[model samples]
Target chain A: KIPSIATGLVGALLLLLVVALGIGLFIRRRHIVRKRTLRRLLQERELVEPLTPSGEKLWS
Target chain B: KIPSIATGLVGALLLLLVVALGIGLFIRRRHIVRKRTLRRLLQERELVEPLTPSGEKLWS
Candidate 1:
């Protein structure tokens, strides 16, 4: 049988894992929005830069 | 009594959840570095724009 505190510890860690996932998804959405804004600005200004072979912006 | 495969499935999910955490942290760090680079560029150029009341850039 598991000790009571061990169960509590596992529960807490799982909660933390859930919270991390929520925060990560939120930040990722924000990052995507930021990237799109930068791309839009670049397109509007007719500015260009050397891209990585994979074509992602250095800042992206 | 728990089946052996059920235990294995739980172990696999736990491992995947851990991997997700690792990737999330790595991407978060990259996003922060990109934000800092953008801020540095903006500062070097003496660019001015209305910032959010919280002082974050429109894209940040």
Candidate 2:
């Protein structure tokens, strides 16, 4: 019974982790894309319009 | 025999999932901080200097 309960807890934790990994994979790609886009925008100077100290609030 | 084999398989998979989750969580936080820094850099217009097309390659 103890072994079974331990297995059950570990199994449930693993399931949660698996789910987290799945979501993380999806989000990881988006982050890569965003990093790429930000880099490009930085070069293009389109990341934020200048003269606005509130630029981050507007763009982010 | 059959039940044991199934349990073993599930246990192995669970272990793998747990390790993957641990790594992902660590990486995810770094990713988040990187993202926040980028956003702040963008607002400051410090993300990339406007004169270089190779800005990302240089910074990244």
Candidate 3:
């Protein structure tokens, strides 16, 4: 009982959880897009670097 | 009334919850960055090893 949330609060907590999940998904999507962009740009530019501004590199 | 916190405390708790979430977001971002870096390096190297040091593999 102590671990379980109150019935009334369950919906509220679930709503909050959904919001949290949305934020997580948003972050993941942004990260994916950033990665793809970096890969494409590097290949197009024909540049090699140990580190990109965002801490990602070609070999890394 | 017995279960409900004092009005002042409720707001404080909510604020704390947000702060906790912010910290969680920072940690998750760092994790994704690490995973992306590891994958990028592995693919570029063509090492052909099944396991990578970053706890992620070519197919998992």
- The residue-by-residue lDDT of candidate 1 on A1-60, one tens digit each, is 434444444554666677679987999888755544444543433445455567456546
CAPRI quality band, candidate 3: incorrect
The residue pairs found clashing in candidate 2 are: none
Question: Model 1 chain A, poorest ten-residue lDDT window?
Answer: A37-46
After the best TM-score superposition of candidate 1, give how far the Cα of residue B33 lies from its true spot, in angstroms: 10
DockQ class, candidate 2? incorrect
Candidate 2: segments with Cα more than 4 A from true spot? A35-60, B1-60
lDDT of 3 by residue, A1-60 (tens): 232235335544655667669988999887755545445644643444355366456446
lDDT by residue for model 2 (A1-60), tens: 345545655665666667779988999887755545557665555445467475676677
Which candidate would rank higher by DockQ, 1 or 2? 2
Pick out the ten consecutive residues of candidate 1 chain B with the lowest summed lDDT.
Answer: B37-46
Question: What does DockQ give for each predicted structure?
Answer: 0.07, 0.09, 0.05
Chain A TM-scores, all candidates?
0.47, 0.44, 0.40
Give lDDT tens digits, candidate 2, residues B1-60: 235445645765766667779987989888755435446665655455467476686676
- The TM-score values for the models, in the order shown, are 0.31, 0.28, 0.30
Candidate 1 lDDT for residue B53: 68
Chain A TM-score for candidate 3 is 0.40
CAPRI accuracy category, model 1: incorrect
Measured with C-alpha atoms, the lDDT of residue B14 in candidate 1 is 67
